[PDB]
């Protein structure tokens, strides 16, 4: 059967305007009509959206759904079945804030994706990375400065795996794709949440990265890559990685190179604000909160650099633990620097391109998938109607069906 | 001693004509004379072949002799001695359909080869690949969508899983030690495997080049399973010699293939069979989802190959009880290119693929006595071959008579 | 439907007489009537058995169906598929010799047993031991006088090497999981193995006891290979049910055997064959050295067994091409004990060994229809059974007729 | 009764959260396994001491584990101040298990009164599970 959101103000994003009193007609899981032509079907299932903004459901391009606490070391070592349980409230909450798709950046597997798709569990559609690839001592390696023992099997609460070497990574990519990853995540730089690696230095040989990219391309996907500095970014892009995560410390040299190659960026500014306030407080090791001071500085600044060089920007949050609540705040941070049109584009049209679903998600058009948010107010003028923690979103539709009434 | 097929109409394939009332003289395992002489018969076994076509034994370039059921996964996991037993009917039937030689595309080994050569077992001469090479999550990896891995070779297993330049190098060396005649690899997604979409490529160019090299070092070649023009082109550029299936070529890939001197072995019959009895004969539901797409361009590709001038071999690639439909591939090819070409694919071109140029696939002096005796003329009615064995009443293999029907 | 063997002379073994012009009526797989009535046949397959002996199909309690060549060491190393193939003739020949059931003493598995039961393969019903258990350097260890071992089961290996209580415990649990019907061990040195003198005992008592327990836990028994009285006595004290060979008993051990209710399965015919064609058929020269001694006391042992009152089942144990001599064991045994006994060994005593008392080895109502039709009377001339084949013209198996000769 | 492998072998490094049972043989093997399970915080120990219904290869009449193994398990459980529960159908399978020192018998559908008497005497409990058989009937 069939559903109609009637008399809504449909956000069109490539033009940047509301289209008032347009109806949107859902059949099955797809959008069949956007129009103001009075619709004649009594057989439908209808929902009055008068004076309310109806837009595509949001896509978040960097989450760790399984990061149920801020210490990723201790997150990895929690018992499997508990790791799973604790991710359910995280997922349910992301959906209520209007996120209907998320790209998990290591942690979530094909099983979790299936659980939402068969409706066993409430949450956004997941684009799983499986596990982030990391070299030894890398941003994925949570072993303290000892040492070097250990590790047999995959803990379901582990964000990453350690693999080194050209054949090693090649095999790990094939393994990850067989297990059902949609894209491949690697650490190409030092980070913040790992014990041993200062943020300034690079990770993985160019041979390794390039082998990784190839195996991903052979499986008709791409590599996303965690990198801070212009140095670490440039080489990753030269090796052919498609999206760059964080990227807080670009120079316009790297940005220009990124635009040239057609590489995306997914800044995750919100996480650094959260780790600023509640860093050592929520149980993340004291020398990881030492590293967070520096990256948030250039964070806001980098946005402008990316805009200037014309490098596409996707929405990301990358929040850990109870700081998961601050997810929507990333809209306001981005709106304050680039327009709030751009802020909304990052979570929709740009994001859907990132996840290769151009025309399938992130757009209210005929033939697209019925992932809709119904919004009380107009985001194009007040960004707060989206960036206020689930406050002003009263309907969420996912693949045709209604999943949140608020 | 010595044998004469007298008064047959000998099919000559390079000219494309029957030669009526030509006697053919077999001494030992070799053809000694082909003539329309009244022939000097003292102690010969005369077999009277008046008004019947005598042609070379057919060579199928892509079989899985051990694929005794359509789920290749469950095929792998059946007990060794059962896997072996169940292939015996399969081999027997192929021969009685007139196939005197098969190139096996992963599964059969040197021991099976020997079983038929010593006459312990009835069926075609085998040119065994040993085991198909496949990368992890590749077309020969049959694990479902967190995987422990095995270390002993099941005799029902079509493939083995090897990754890396060194890994594949060792694997080739091993396969040839065990007595492979050529090397099979999966260079693309397929249909009969769980996790790989058909559109994507398998193995790095590094891995393939190493494999080709280790092949060439043993004076043999690589056969490569591959669908799309992209997967094909890169395999050819690495130097693989035959390309299996090849359903989704563009003409840029076909041209390249022509340029390099690379054959194709399409296997169109297997998609029609998988169309009718796919989910019915125990092949997983999401594999029969993947069979819809490849049969479309299937017939169309043959024209592309013909146009760019790429030599085409005969291949069935049928699994399980669908093995019966083997000869049907003659029809499917004859409908698109002439039935000359259809017969050429299973004789002259096929023998070239297996490097038995002048040894098999031609009725000539000095060649091996692999003959089929045919009730009717295939050059006008392709059905005399393509009817599951109906109209073949004699099969000769290395001189001796093996089928009387 | 339904079948009648009419007018035969039905051998009754517990009374030791032919019953002339008795009809036997088969429905399905079972014997429904034995009588000298004019019988009421509407839709019965009448097979006319006038003046010919009809007796139960023979049971051989010690074969190796997979021993396709006399050097067991090289039999183990032959490729899998080839090991399986070569057993097919062996199974066929046995059945045609009247043997409708065999207990395989190491080699055959559950798959082979299934292949005959589903009718995929012609042969006797098999009662597979799986793989014999052997201690290291034991009668099943075929390594020559350095050894790292070997983590994969070759389908032509008679045995496996396992030591220690938990090792053997696990091995039995494995074999029974893979579907053995009973468990075979090597409790002494032998002939066909490189390193063990025949006088030596194998496995401690803790090992044997553990094995016996695991067999009984799965409601079956252990058969044990043993020559000397010493090696026999301790095996029986540990609780083994049947003793294989047993050529070197004293009457002390035989008395013990009788007391415990243990069976013997002598295999005299294998030593006579290994004498003539020993080194000739490719069994290692120092194994033919050991064969001289056991055959001496071979016939003498039969008497000791009869005197002590120990039940004796039929067994060949022939390897390779010496498999032909299978029926000659009847003669050997008839020469020492009456040919009533010889026939009892392969029928009633046998059926008991394999726990099918009442099911096989007797023509009675309710029994399985495993029948042999015999030209002549075995009760007076033992040659009618003991002549390689020759004088058996019908073989019925589970109702159906499988050989017409 | 816990081995779900169909009628080759070598199993499996690590524990799937969906797995009812693990496979362990031998006195030292079971002894360890019990210590591992108690470390991981089990409150009691379950063993399979006879064939069952839900497993592929075991007929129901036959027994599982040697008496040495069961005794080792019962000791390691008692050592951690808990007990063994045991899956077991026939009176033969029950009797042995009880005399090795197991405290509760699961199912126990095929007791004779001799085994019942032995249970009472030893103070062992039974946990019949009749409803599962009616459900698996339908
Ligand atoms: Zn990161
Ligand atoms: Zn991250
Ligand atoms: Zn293929
Ligand atoms: Zn194939
Ligand atoms: Zn023996
Ligand atoms: Zn033996
Ligand atoms: Zn239970």
PDB file of C-alpha atoms in Angstrom, chain C residues 162-325:
ATOM      1  CA  UNK C 162      47.223 -43.053  18.221  1.00  0.00           C
ATOM      2  CA  UNK C 163      48.822 -43.495  21.604  1.00  0.00           C
ATOM      3  CA  UNK C 164      47.704 -42.915  25.150  1.00  0.00           C
ATOM      4  CA  UNK C 165      44.461 -43.211  27.030  1.00  0.00           C
ATOM      5  CA  UNK C 166      42.966 -39.860  26.058  1.00  0.00           C
ATOM      6  CA  UNK C 167      44.324 -40.230  22.528  1.00  0.00           C
ATOM      7  CA  UNK C 168      42.618 -43.550  21.981  1.00  0.00           C
ATOM      8  CA  UNK C 169      39.489 -42.399  23.806  1.00  0.00           C
ATOM      9  CA  UNK C 170      39.150 -39.514  21.412  1.00  0.00           C
ATOM     10  CA  UNK C 171      39.939 -41.691  18.369  1.00  0.00           C
ATOM     11  CA  UNK C 172      37.137 -44.130  19.232  1.00  0.00           C
ATOM     12  CA  UNK C 173      34.713 -41.236  19.766  1.00  0.00           C
ATOM     13  CA  UNK C 174      35.812 -39.901  16.409  1.00  0.00           C
ATOM     14  CA  UNK C 175      35.448 -43.242  14.600  1.00  0.00           C
ATOM     15  CA  UNK C 176      31.971 -43.812  16.024  1.00  0.00           C
ATOM     16  CA  UNK C 177      30.977 -40.273  15.072  1.00  0.00           C
ATOM     17  CA  UNK C 178      32.146 -40.909  11.494  1.00  0.00           C
ATOM     18  CA  UNK C 179      29.890 -43.981  11.691  1.00  0.00           C
ATOM     19  CA  UNK C 180      31.951 -47.095  12.437  1.00  0.00           C
ATOM     20  CA  UNK C 181      29.810 -50.093  13.433  1.00  0.00           C
ATOM     21  CA  UNK C 182      32.623 -51.592  15.513  1.00  0.00           C
ATOM     22  CA  UNK C 183      36.205 -50.702  16.529  1.00  0.00           C
ATOM     23  CA  UNK C 184      39.398 -52.468  15.322  1.00  0.00           C
ATOM     24  CA  UNK C 185      42.691 -52.396  17.212  1.00  0.00           C
ATOM     25  CA  UNK C 186      46.130 -53.973  16.771  1.00  0.00           C
ATOM     26  CA  UNK C 187      46.935 -55.714  20.043  1.00  0.00           C
ATOM     27  CA  UNK C 188      50.062 -57.437  18.786  1.00  0.00           C
ATOM     28  CA  UNK C 189      52.783 -57.438  16.157  1.00  0.00           C
ATOM     29  CA  UNK C 190      51.943 -58.835  12.747  1.00  0.00           C
ATOM     30  CA  UNK C 191      53.170 -59.777   9.292  1.00  0.00           C
ATOM     31  CA  UNK C 192      52.367 -56.949   6.867  1.00  0.00           C
ATOM     32  CA  UNK C 193      54.104 -54.192   8.877  1.00  0.00           C
ATOM     33  CA  UNK C 194      57.793 -53.158   8.776  1.00  0.00           C
ATOM     34  CA  UNK C 195      58.975 -52.837  12.387  1.00  0.00           C
ATOM     35  CA  UNK C 196      57.045 -55.160  14.751  1.00  0.00           C
ATOM     36  CA  UNK C 197      58.065 -58.766  15.465  1.00  0.00           C
ATOM     37  CA  UNK C 198      54.983 -60.920  15.799  1.00  0.00           C
ATOM     38  CA  UNK C 199      55.623 -62.076  19.396  1.00  0.00           C
ATOM     39  CA  UNK C 200      55.297 -58.552  20.876  1.00  0.00           C
ATOM     40  CA  UNK C 201      52.165 -57.101  22.505  1.00  0.00           C
ATOM     41  CA  UNK C 202      50.783 -53.699  21.517  1.00  0.00           C
ATOM     42  CA  UNK C 203      48.963 -51.061  23.554  1.00  0.00           C
ATOM     43  CA  UNK C 204      49.040 -51.149  27.341  1.00  0.00           C
ATOM     44  CA  UNK C 205      46.016 -52.498  29.226  1.00  0.00           C
ATOM     45  CA  UNK C 206      44.898 -48.966  30.137  1.00  0.00           C
ATOM     46  CA  UNK C 207      44.639 -48.114  26.452  1.00  0.00           C
ATOM     47  CA  UNK C 208      42.727 -51.238  25.482  1.00  0.00           C
ATOM     48  CA  UNK C 209      40.341 -50.891  28.422  1.00  0.00           C
ATOM     49  CA  UNK C 210      39.631 -47.248  27.524  1.00  0.00           C
ATOM     50  CA  UNK C 211      38.871 -48.332  23.937  1.00  0.00           C
ATOM     51  CA  UNK C 212      36.564 -51.159  25.022  1.00  0.00           C
ATOM     52  CA  UNK C 213      34.693 -48.688  27.249  1.00  0.00           C
ATOM     53  CA  UNK C 214      34.136 -46.154  24.460  1.00  0.00           C
ATOM     54  CA  UNK C 215      32.910 -48.905  22.157  1.00  0.00           C
ATOM     55  CA  UNK C 216      30.474 -50.203  24.790  1.00  0.00           C
ATOM     56  CA  UNK C 217      29.309 -46.652  25.424  1.00  0.00           C
ATOM     57  CA  UNK C 218      28.191 -46.628  21.802  1.00  0.00           C
ATOM     58  CA  UNK C 219      26.612 -50.071  22.101  1.00  0.00           C
ATOM     59  CA  UNK C 220      29.258 -51.841  20.027  1.00  0.00           C
ATOM     60  CA  UNK C 221      32.405 -53.916  20.601  1.00  0.00           C
ATOM     61  CA  UNK C 222      36.128 -54.036  19.840  1.00  0.00           C
ATOM     62  CA  UNK C 223      37.738 -56.535  17.431  1.00  0.00           C
ATOM     63  CA  UNK C 224      41.445 -57.128  18.130  1.00  0.00           C
ATOM     64  CA  UNK C 225      44.292 -58.380  15.977  1.00  0.00           C
ATOM     65  CA  UNK C 226      46.426 -60.800  18.020  1.00  0.00           C
ATOM     66  CA  UNK C 227      48.650 -63.829  17.427  1.00  0.00           C
ATOM     67  CA  UNK C 228      50.238 -65.299  20.565  1.00  0.00           C
ATOM     68  CA  UNK C 229      48.360 -66.627  23.577  1.00  0.00           C
ATOM     69  CA  UNK C 230      49.889 -63.879  25.715  1.00  0.00           C
ATOM     70  CA  UNK C 231      48.652 -61.125  23.389  1.00  0.00           C
ATOM     71  CA  UNK C 232      45.273 -62.818  23.208  1.00  0.00           C
ATOM     72  CA  UNK C 233      44.816 -63.360  26.941  1.00  0.00           C
ATOM     73  CA  UNK C 234      45.290 -59.739  27.973  1.00  0.00           C
ATOM     74  CA  UNK C 235      43.118 -58.421  25.145  1.00  0.00           C
ATOM     75  CA  UNK C 236      40.301 -60.688  26.308  1.00  0.00           C
ATOM     76  CA  UNK C 237      40.838 -59.762  29.966  1.00  0.00           C
ATOM     77  CA  UNK C 238      40.474 -56.133  28.938  1.00  0.00           C
ATOM     78  CA  UNK C 239      37.205 -56.943  27.282  1.00  0.00           C
ATOM     79  CA  UNK C 240      37.593 -57.372  23.567  1.00  0.00           C
ATOM     80  CA  UNK C 241      34.847 -59.347  21.913  1.00  0.00           C
ATOM     81  CA  UNK C 242      36.377 -60.828  18.790  1.00  0.00           C
ATOM     82  CA  UNK C 243      40.014 -61.869  18.252  1.00  0.00           C
ATOM     83  CA  UNK C 244      41.429 -61.667  14.708  1.00  0.00           C
ATOM     84  CA  UNK C 245      43.824 -64.311  13.354  1.00  0.00           C
ATOM     85  CA  UNK C 246      44.811 -65.909  16.635  1.00  0.00           C
ATOM     86  CA  UNK C 247      47.205 -68.361  15.000  1.00  0.00           C
ATOM     87  CA  UNK C 248      49.416 -68.908  18.043  1.00  0.00           C
ATOM     88  CA  UNK C 249      47.004 -69.717  20.887  1.00  0.00           C
ATOM     89  CA  UNK C 250      47.735 -72.020  23.747  1.00  0.00           C
ATOM     90  CA  UNK C 251      44.817 -73.924  25.248  1.00  0.00           C
ATOM     91  CA  UNK C 252      45.074 -71.782  28.355  1.00  0.00           C
ATOM     92  CA  UNK C 253      44.133 -68.662  26.348  1.00  0.00           C
ATOM     93  CA  UNK C 254      41.445 -70.526  24.444  1.00  0.00           C
ATOM     94  CA  UNK C 255      39.896 -71.662  27.729  1.00  0.00           C
ATOM     95  CA  UNK C 256      39.943 -68.041  28.856  1.00  0.00           C
ATOM     96  CA  UNK C 257      38.364 -66.979  25.565  1.00  0.00           C
ATOM     97  CA  UNK C 258      35.571 -69.534  25.912  1.00  0.00           C
ATOM     98  CA  UNK C 259      34.961 -68.419  29.499  1.00  0.00           C
ATOM     99  CA  UNK C 260      34.615 -64.755  28.560  1.00  0.00           C
ATOM    100  CA  UNK C 261      32.412 -65.589  25.574  1.00  0.00           C
ATOM    101  CA  UNK C 262      34.879 -64.164  23.056  1.00  0.00           C
ATOM    102  CA  UNK C 263      34.932 -65.048  19.328  1.00  0.00           C
ATOM    103  CA  UNK C 264      37.814 -65.834  16.988  1.00  0.00           C
ATOM    104  CA  UNK C 265      38.034 -64.978  13.325  1.00  0.00           C
ATOM    105  CA  UNK C 266      40.926 -66.950  11.848  1.00  0.00           C
ATOM    106  CA  UNK C 267      42.225 -65.923   8.399  1.00  0.00           C
ATOM    107  CA  UNK C 268      44.278 -68.954   7.275  1.00  0.00           C
ATOM    108  CA  UNK C 269      43.791 -68.397   3.529  1.00  0.00           C
ATOM    109  CA  UNK C 270      45.807 -65.165   3.600  1.00  0.00           C
ATOM    110  CA  UNK C 271      48.961 -66.946   4.731  1.00  0.00           C
ATOM    111  CA  UNK C 272      48.723 -69.566   2.013  1.00  0.00           C
ATOM    112  CA  UNK C 273      48.399 -66.778  -0.536  1.00  0.00           C
ATOM    113  CA  UNK C 274      51.222 -64.783   1.004  1.00  0.00           C
ATOM    114  CA  UNK C 275      53.359 -67.900   0.908  1.00  0.00           C
ATOM    115  CA  UNK C 276      52.938 -68.459  -2.865  1.00  0.00           C
ATOM    116  CA  UNK C 277      52.783 -64.903  -4.137  1.00  0.00           C
ATOM    117  CA  UNK C 278      54.305 -62.981  -1.249  1.00  0.00           C
ATOM    118  CA  UNK C 279      57.366 -61.113  -2.457  1.00  0.00           C
ATOM    119  CA  UNK C 280      55.895 -61.658  -5.915  1.00  0.00           C
ATOM    120  CA  UNK C 281      52.973 -59.240  -5.470  1.00  0.00           C
ATOM    121  CA  UNK C 282      55.137 -56.486  -4.010  1.00  0.00           C
ATOM    122  CA  UNK C 283      54.931 -56.978  -0.254  1.00  0.00           C
ATOM    123  CA  UNK C 284      58.305 -56.011   1.361  1.00  0.00           C
ATOM    124  CA  UNK C 285      60.861 -58.866   1.716  1.00  0.00           C
ATOM    125  CA  UNK C 286      61.071 -58.820   5.534  1.00  0.00           C
ATOM    126  CA  UNK C 287      57.296 -59.146   5.836  1.00  0.00           C
ATOM    127  CA  UNK C 288      57.340 -62.377   3.813  1.00  0.00           C
ATOM    128  CA  UNK C 289      59.989 -63.483   6.305  1.00  0.00           C
ATOM    129  CA  UNK C 290      57.417 -63.355   9.084  1.00  0.00           C
ATOM    130  CA  UNK C 291      54.721 -65.228   7.132  1.00  0.00           C
ATOM    131  CA  UNK C 292      56.516 -68.575   7.369  1.00  0.00           C
ATOM    132  CA  UNK C 293      55.845 -69.001  11.088  1.00  0.00           C
ATOM    133  CA  UNK C 294      52.161 -68.199  11.582  1.00  0.00           C
ATOM    134  CA  UNK C 295      50.764 -70.590   8.970  1.00  0.00           C
ATOM    135  CA  UNK C 296      52.387 -73.586  10.673  1.00  0.00           C
ATOM    136  CA  UNK C 297      50.236 -73.495  13.794  1.00  0.00           C
ATOM    137  CA  UNK C 298      47.419 -72.080  11.632  1.00  0.00           C
ATOM    138  CA  UNK C 299      45.494 -75.298  11.078  1.00  0.00           C
ATOM    139  CA  UNK C 300      46.537 -76.615  14.493  1.00  0.00           C
ATOM    140  CA  UNK C 301      44.970 -73.592  16.199  1.00  0.00           C
ATOM    141  CA  UNK C 302      41.579 -74.405  14.697  1.00  0.00           C
ATOM    142  CA  UNK C 303      41.565 -77.633  16.721  1.00  0.00           C
ATOM    143  CA  UNK C 304      42.499 -75.897  19.993  1.00  0.00           C
ATOM    144  CA  UNK C 305      39.612 -73.498  19.414  1.00  0.00           C
ATOM    145  CA  UNK C 306      37.113 -76.290  18.782  1.00  0.00           C
ATOM    146  CA  UNK C 307      38.355 -78.196  21.824  1.00  0.00           C
ATOM    147  CA  UNK C 308      37.976 -75.189  24.102  1.00  0.00           C
ATOM    148  CA  UNK C 309      34.588 -74.466  22.543  1.00  0.00           C
ATOM    149  CA  UNK C 310      35.373 -70.984  21.210  1.00  0.00           C
ATOM    150  CA  UNK C 311      33.054 -69.747  18.448  1.00  0.00           C
ATOM    151  CA  UNK C 312      34.863 -69.265  15.123  1.00  0.00           C
ATOM    152  CA  UNK C 313      33.792 -66.889  12.358  1.00  0.00           C
ATOM    153  CA  UNK C 314      34.867 -66.867   8.714  1.00  0.00           C
ATOM    154  CA  UNK C 315      37.620 -64.452   7.621  1.00  0.00           C
ATOM    155  CA  UNK C 316      39.832 -63.922   4.568  1.00  0.00           C
ATOM    156  CA  UNK C 317      42.071 -60.875   5.125  1.00  0.00           C
ATOM    157  CA  UNK C 318      43.343 -61.107   1.543  1.00  0.00           C
ATOM    158  CA  UNK C 319      45.161 -58.126   0.020  1.00  0.00           C
ATOM    159  CA  UNK C 320      45.476 -56.955  -3.564  1.00  0.00           C
ATOM    160  CA  UNK C 321      45.121 -59.483  -6.398  1.00  0.00           C
ATOM    161  CA  UNK C 322      45.223 -62.281  -3.825  1.00  0.00           C
ATOM    162  CA  UNK C 323      41.616 -61.223  -3.179  1.00  0.00           C
ATOM    163  CA  UNK C 324      40.510 -63.879  -5.644  1.00  0.00           C
ATOM    164  CA  UNK C 325      41.299 -66.726  -3.226  1.00  0.00           C
TER     165      UNK C 325
END
